[PDB]
Structures are given as structure tokens and as C-alpha cells.
Amino acid sequence: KYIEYPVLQKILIGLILGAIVGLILGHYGYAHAVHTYVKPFGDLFVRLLKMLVMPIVFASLVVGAASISPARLGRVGVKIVVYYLLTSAFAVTLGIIMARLFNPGAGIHLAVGGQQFQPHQAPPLVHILLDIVPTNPFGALANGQVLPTIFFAIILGIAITYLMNSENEKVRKSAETLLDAINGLAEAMYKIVNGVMQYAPIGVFALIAYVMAEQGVHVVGELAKVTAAVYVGLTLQILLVYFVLLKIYGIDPISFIKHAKDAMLTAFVTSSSSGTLPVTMRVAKEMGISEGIYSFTLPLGATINMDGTALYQGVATFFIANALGSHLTVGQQLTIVLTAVLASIGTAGVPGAGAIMLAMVLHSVGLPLTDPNVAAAYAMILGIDAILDRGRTMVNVTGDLTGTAIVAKTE
Amino acid sequence: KYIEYPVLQKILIGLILGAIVGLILGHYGYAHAVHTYVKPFGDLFVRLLKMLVMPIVFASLVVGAASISPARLGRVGVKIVVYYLLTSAFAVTLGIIMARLFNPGAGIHLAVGGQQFQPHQAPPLVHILLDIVPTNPFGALANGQVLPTIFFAIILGIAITYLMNSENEKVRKSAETLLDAINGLAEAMYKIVNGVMQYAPIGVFALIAYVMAEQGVHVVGELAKVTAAVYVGLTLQILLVYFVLLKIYGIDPISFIKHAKDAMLTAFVTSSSSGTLPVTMRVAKEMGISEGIYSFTLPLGATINMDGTALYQGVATFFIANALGSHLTVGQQLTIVLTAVLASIGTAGVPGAGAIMLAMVLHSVGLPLTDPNVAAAYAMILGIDAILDRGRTMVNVTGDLTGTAIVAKTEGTLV
Amino acid sequence: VLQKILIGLILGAIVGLILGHYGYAHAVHTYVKPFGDLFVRLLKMLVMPIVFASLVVGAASISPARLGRVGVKIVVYYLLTSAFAVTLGIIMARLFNPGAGIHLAVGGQQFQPHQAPPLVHILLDIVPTNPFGALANGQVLPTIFFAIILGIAITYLMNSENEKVRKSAETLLDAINGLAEAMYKIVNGVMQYAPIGVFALIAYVMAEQGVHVVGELAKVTAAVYVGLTLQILLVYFVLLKIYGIDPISFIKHAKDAMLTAFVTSSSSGTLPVTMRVAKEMGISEGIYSFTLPLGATINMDGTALYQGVATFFIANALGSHLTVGQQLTIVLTAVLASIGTAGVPGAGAIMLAMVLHSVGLPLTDPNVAAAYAMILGIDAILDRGRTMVNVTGDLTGTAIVAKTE
């Protein structure tokens, strides 16, 4: 009774099997059953994603503050970042534009707790800007609030790279040993991470088994409404940005696609900016780009500059809002712009943590995942991430290929 | 004004001196005094036991997940574990049977806070099975809830033994240094542990000084009711299990006891599965058992398979329940079976943390130690653990001697 | 660093009465507040980790083991000097009355001094029931009793028979220490916001009652300074003279270990300097080689006195008559703070943190905290002045103990 299988199908057959199993259960008779039996395995999966973050988000971002230690020369790739921001900023814009045309979410009245979502109005920015600084990092980290457990983790690890340097030898030996422990927790988390991706097949099955039992069936159409709103928005900015800003330069925008070939192919199948990096790296070499340019910019387009993930989140948010029976207002709309950018700037680049960074793009713009109406809707859109992750990644990689080819004009 | 003394008497003379001091105080006059003066040193001791666990239970169980790392060959001692479960399962059964015959607890109406225990009914298993997974390990660990601070500590340390292996050299150097820190906290805890066992003489005195002042005196008889319910249950399964399943095999069950001699003796005096392990190890060699058998099984009967501790907890629970004025219901009864097994599978094997694993066998089956009625009763039974620990351990060791001798009938040899 | 906060102090003093008249409405009390407050929190962050990390180090620092005979003599001395220092601070905070002449009301509802819980129940709640919890949500008096009992227990693990257990004990302590340091790195960075946030908070609390509040903080300055110099004469020049050692020429071959202590304001920087100085005044190796590094982190004479004044300052600033017993608790607290204080620049003031938490004056109360903001504000003055003694006090001890053959 054994586990072996390439998981990113295991989940996807979990999904299509879940969808097809779900629909046929609630229809035929026992609309309940699944709520009492199956859902509790989705409830499980959910929890395990959350079990992560806090350690991962601490540990990782202490490492990624020893990784970047001044000198951290952002004095020649000013050009590339300036570009990356605008594309990602325009991507989420385009997502909100696509979540206008299509209205995913509406046509579902999620009541969950015998009671629909009421939106609790945001506190002043004074008070939230100040509550990036923890009053006690341990507390902040502990009970769970994250935006201090960023500001601390960074300010610890940025300060730690001035201790390995310090005059004293034994102080540098102390600074090291702490960082050598924090890192490794980072890794140990990543070892459990993979193991959660091994329960992910069960998890996803149980989620969109429940959704398709309780609340049929033009919820299918609704989630397929997302699929399009995402997809013919993704492909709607490949034409509207890349094919545009390359043409309006002088670079050949059409044959660019042909010598990006397999950096594009894999991005869709691997669904990873990690896997599609020695492939995107080679592809820049293969279309004949200069070393110090693509050698610095394509690894910075890896973690920074997720164009598709910014757009994906700018749709998912809208989906949730309307699914709750909440008319998502303007300003909030352009907060989502600035939030989804500042999420899809820190999103992972593996498979999952696009959706599990959307997490916070919802927490911002009063829509927290504590409210069960929110969460049960999040469960839906996180359920079908496995579809809109493979499709999404393809752009995240192409957007920093195009930037690397646009900036290749500097001599 | 100096401390030196072999402590496991220091406590026990603390107890008998506490008992004899306590009774004569509340009787003669100042029934109070002790409540204001002496109890606050028992209140202290209690807290220090609790100060522990959370670090120890984390740190230890990250180590004991790097200790067992797949490959962790449970492919030949399937036999021994299969046995161990049934004995421990039947032990707590027998404890609940003994806590039926004897009714310890009842005949005390513990009101503590001017108000008796009311039992708050258990939540669905769905919701408690799910709350083994922490939503935030740090939080879980922090404010104190433990069953996530297990599931995390294990899943960290099990995952950590696939990082020292990992292709990268410097990643294995990072994984090590974390585990080399967590371990050592484990040890540092164990250094305070010993220091608490050095206040334990005071602590125990102060506990069963207070109990014997406020609430005399057929509380003596009540706690002695426990003593028997435990003891003539312990000895009631030596005859009923070991002397039975060895006889119904063909192995000589009576002379087994004679070449176990000093593995039994020390178990009662040392009150330790740690101390009685080179002794139980030798004793298996001395009664002529095969190496690869007792060399693998007697160290696994060390921490897993505590027969007596399972039974002890299956009585202590019942004691508490009835002491509160709470008729401990069935199902709960057989939850105690499954709980006390899954406590006496992880109990320590030093002296204390039989009682301080009962801790959780009470938290399960709605009887938490937050409630002062519970806790003041727990203070009683944890008070006299020093009596029912030495007596208890003797079985915990004998039960995996017998298993090792029962499984010694398997021969043999592969291609 | 000093001349950015003392011109800091007068870009607060005046900008309050020239933007409490020309400066209209909440707008000028906005960017006072947000910048008072993006200090306040930014400050409050530090206290806990530091108080844990530091006091695990200052329990491996003092360990009943390998302290002897060379190291029984020196500590015995160090305790008494630091114990007598904070005594002298409380004596100086008697003569001068800093704090009084300010009625800090903060939350329209001044600090009504809070009456001390039954002592049974607070003595018991020094022992944490779960250190993690205690540390986490913030309560400190357990996060002392644990941190100490961890690091005291840890110095019996590096010793332990097993080699690999000593390698494990080390690596933990080598991580905790370093967090200590990492904190001290942020510490300095907070002292860099201290100008435009602790003389932006000051910007308002010098905007009201101005003709009695500069000269209240300058009242501290003296109470500290002519107490520091008042024990150089009263202890060192005394106990060296009453021995036979030449107490006056001692100062001359300490020269640059004294100089730097005032400019560097660091027991870290003034350690290869104080080390050399002991060599240069011709002290024996195994003596000053063991004692001057133990006078580094243990034995802060000035920091003990500084805290024994700062506390009193705060108390009286609140409208709270700081009672006796509390007075001699401060003696035993400030010693057991200035035994674990950092020896960089900041974490004298950010160990006073806990000497206030002890003796019911916690920093959760905004009346306390806004007053702490004042005295932590001008630490940059009384840190350079303070350090000079912290170093001289273990030079003198090293020279006093140099008489053993």
C-alpha cells in the first residue's frame, strides 16, 4: 500500500477525481456524508499549510537577510527592478480589470455559519504601519501575527551579518552558530513541506469533494469562470505587454518566443521558477544574451517579479469578496494592486505559495481568514490552485525573460 | 546547613515526616497555619514540574525522532511490540477492574473553591484529532498545549534526519547544529530536573502536610485504599498474566522469577527502568537468553511497555474522579484504557514522570488540571507517588523480561 | 552620536512651543506622535530578548566552578563594589530629587501606583509554569528565573563527562549569546532613531512645563555624575590607600583605559586597552588575564549606580513616592541587572528596563513608559560618563587582588 508517484499529477488526479466524486455524491443522495467524513481530511490539509508559514517565514527571511548584506550591489540592476515593479504592478491591475469583466464569486451566496460575511472596516494606517514593529518579537511570532515576524526576522539577520564581521573571533563564531541553526530550521521546514505536498493529493481531493457536494453545480461554472478570468488575462498581457513593449522598442518580439521555447514549456509543466531557472538561464544563453546581464537578472526575476502570481491574486481576491456577498470597493481595489505586488514580490516560486501568499493579500483589505465565510471560500480557490499554478508560472518566468531581453539593450 | 543525601529516601522521609507532622497539626489546633505557611512550598514544587514538560517534551521528542530515522527496522520485533501493547492494554484494564473493587476517592467530597467539580463534556473527535496538528507550532508550544507540540517536535526531528543526509555538505552542517542545540536543551532541562528532585523532599512534605491537616483522617485510609488497589492489582497480574501465559506456553514460569532475582530487586529499590537496565540486561544473559533478541527487546521494553504505570494511571484517574464527586462514566473508562496505554508508552522511566504523565490521562476524559478541584486532588495522588513508584516500576521491568522470554521461543535463522 | 541628540534635545525643546502656537491642531501633534510611537514600539521590542539572552550569558559568566582561588577573590570584591555603587546611587537620588517637579499624567489618567499583589502569589509567579509562554506573552520575572536557571545549569554541561554533550551545550550558548549581540546591534540602531523619536516624544513633554524639565534631566546628569566621581574618591582612592597600594599614580598608568572608556563608551573597545593598561602598569598575567575579562561583563559599578538613580527618577516623575525595601530591592535588582548588562553602549538603559519591572513599575503602563522614554532618551550622555567607572572598577579590583603571593 505505497506512495510512489510524481505528485503534481497525484494532486491533479486527486482534483479531477475529487470533482467527479464530489458532484455525484451530493446529487444521488447523501449530501451530508462528505461533510462528516471527507471534509475532515481537507480540514487537516488546510491546517498543515498554516503549521508552516510562521517558522518558514521567520527562518527563511533571516537567511534572506544574511544572503543580502550591504554591500548588496543594486547599483546596476536598478534598470531591471524598475521594470519588474511596473510589470507586476500592471499585471495585478490587469487582473482586477479581468475580475471586472468576468464576475467570479457572485452567483454564490456563501452563508457558512448560518450567517453571511459582514466586513469590519479597516483601522488607520498610522496604527498598522506602527504594528509592523513588534513590541515583543517572541509574542508576535508566537500567537501568529506575521508583519512583525517579518520586520524582526529581517532586522535580526541584517544585523547578524555585522557580527560575523565583528572584530572578535569568538563573537563571529557565536553569530554563525545561531544562523547555522535558524537556517536548517528553514530546511527542516522544507522537509515537512515536501511531506505536506505528499498529503496534498488527499487534501485537494477532500476540499473540492466537499465544495462539489455542498453547493452544486454552477459552482463548477463559477470556478471555471475564474479559470478563464485568469487564463485569458495571462495570455491577454503576453500580447498587451511583452509583444507590445518589445515591438515599441525594436527587438523582435515574435521570434523571442521561439528561442524561449523550453523555458516556456517547462514553466507550464514543472510549475516552478526553481526548475525553470537552469532552463531559463540556458535559454537566455541560447538566444545569445550577455553574461553579467542575464546572470544577475534572471535569478532576481526568480523570486522578485512574479507577473502572473500578481494577476492571479488580483482575481482570487475579487472572487472571494463576491463569493461572500461583499461588494469589494475601490481603493481596496488599488490596495490589492499594492498588496499583490508586495506579495508576489515575496511569493515562493515552488508550486503552492502563490495561493498561500494570497493568504495575506486577503488579510489586507479587511477579509481575514479567521472568518469561516472567508476561509471556506479560500478553501475553494486554494483547491483549484493546482490548475491556475501551472498556467500561472509560465508568465512569472516569461516576464523576466522579456525584461532581461529589454535591458539587454544597454551598451 | 547542607544538602547531601540519596534523595529517594529524602523524599520518602519527607513523606512519612509530612504525614506524621500534618495529622498532628490540624488536630491539635491551628488547622489553618499550614494553609498559609507550608502549602506555599507545595504550590512551589507543583509549578516546577510544570515548568519542565514543555521544553523537555519538545526537546526530548525532537531527539527521539532523530534517534528513530527510517530505516528504523521494526521488521523482526513486530513480535515483541504486538505483545507489549496487549500487556499494557490488559494492565490498565486490570487497573480499572481494581479501581472498581476498591473505590478510592469516594468518601472525600473535595469542594476546594467553595464549589465542587462540574464536568465539561468532551468535544467531537473530529475537532480534537485535527487539533493534534498545530496551526502555529510556536503558539502551540508557547501558551502550552502539548499534543501539537508533539506532532511538531516529531515531524521536525523526523524531517531533520533527511537533512544531515542531504546532498549539500553545508546543509548537513546546518541541520546538525540545530539538533545539537535542541539536544542539550534536552540535557539542560535534565540538569534542572535533578535539581527539582532535590527540592522534591520539601515539596512532597508540604503537599501531604496540607492534605493531612485540611481533611483528616480517613483520607489516610483513602490513600491507603489506593495503595492496595494498586499493589494487590500489580501482584494480581504477575500471577494472572506472566505466571499464566508462560505456563500456558511451556516455559517454566516459577524459576523464571529466581533468575530474574536482582532485575526485580533493584526495580523496587532504584524505582528506575534506567538503573534496572544493565541489571535487566545482565539478568537476561544470566538466564541464558539469545543476544539479538534481548539486546533489541529489553531496551525497547525500557521506554515502551510500562505495564505497571498503565495500571497505576488507570487507578489514579478513578481515584481523582471519585474524589471530586464525579461518577466516571464508561467509554471514558475505555478511553482511559487507550489513553493510559498511550501515556505509559511515552512515560519516562526515571522516577517521577509516571504521575506526571497521568497528568494527560486526566486532561483526556474531561478532567483538566486547570480546575482547582482536580488539581488539589492530583496534589494528593502525586504526593504519594513516591510509594507507588517503587512498587510500580518492579512490574514495568518484569513485563518486558517475560516478553523477552516468551519471544525467546522463535527459531530460526534465514537463507 | 552625542552631538546629534543634544542638538536633538533642542530640536525638541523649542519645536514644541513654536509648533504649539504656530503649529495648528492635531497635525503638529501627529508627526510628534507617529514619530514618538514608531519609537515607542521600536524601543519596547528590545527589552525581552535582551533580558533573556543577556541573563543566560550572565549565568554562564558566573559559574560555581573554575571560579577559584584566583576567581573567588575577584568576584567577592566585584559584588561588594557594585552593591555599594547602587547604594551610593540611591544615596545620590536622595540628595538630588530628579523626577519630582514633573507630574506625568500621560493618559489623562495619571499613574495611580498599583498596590502589590499578595506576596505568596507573586513570589510563586517568579517560577514560570511554562517558560515559553512566560517569555512569549511578555512577563519578565519568570523570564529571569528561567534564563538564570538555564544558564547556571548550562555551565554544568560543558563540564559533563561526555565530550559531545559539552559540544551540544556550547552550541546552544553560542547561539543565545549572539542573539544577545544581535539585539545590541539593533540597540545601537534605536539610539540612532532616539534623536528624531525620543526628542520627538520629548518635543511634546518639553513643550509643557519647560522651565522645570530640562533642569530635571540635568538634575539627573549631576546626580549621576557627581555620584560616579563621588565613589571614585570614596571607594577606589579609599580602599587602595587603606591597603598600601599607591592610589593616585594608579590613575596615571590607567590613563588610556580611562580615556577610551569615556569616548568609546564600551567595555568591548576598552578591553584590549584595559588589558594592555594592566600590562603597562605591570600586573601579573594569570591575574589580569582572568580578572579583566570577568570584570568586563560582570562588575559594572557605574551601570549599577546609574540604574539606582534612573529608577528613582522615574518613580518621582510619576508621582509615586518610592518606598523603602523597594529601595533595597533596587540594590539587589540593579546589581542583578548590572551583572548581566551588555557592555556595548545601549543595554545599560535597556536593562534598567527590568529593574523597573521589579519593584512594581512595569513598562506596560504608559505613564511609566513615557518617563522611561525620557531617561532612555538622554542615555547617550550618561552612557559615555557611566562606562568610565565600569572599567575602572575592575582595574582597581585587579590591582587590589594583585596583592596575593
Ligand SMILES: N[C@@H](CC(=O)O)C(=O)O
Ligand atoms: N508557481 C509559482 C509559485 C507560486 O506562486 O506558488 C512559480 O513557480 O512561479
Ligand SMILES: N[C@@H](CC(=O)O)C(=O)O
Ligand atoms: N518509575 C517508572 C517511571 C515512571 O512511571 O515515572 C519506571 O522507572 O519504570
Ligand SMILES: N[C@@H](CC(=O)O)C(=O)O
Ligand atoms: N556603556 C556600558 C554598557 C551599558 O551599560 O549599556 C559599558 O560599556 O560599560
Ligand code: NA
Ligand atoms: Na519569476
Ligand code: NA
Ligand atoms: Na515572488
Ligand code: NA
Ligand atoms: Na519498561
Ligand code: NA
Ligand atoms: Na513508557
Ligand code: NA
Ligand atoms: Na566592566
Ligand code: NA
Ligand atoms: Na554587566
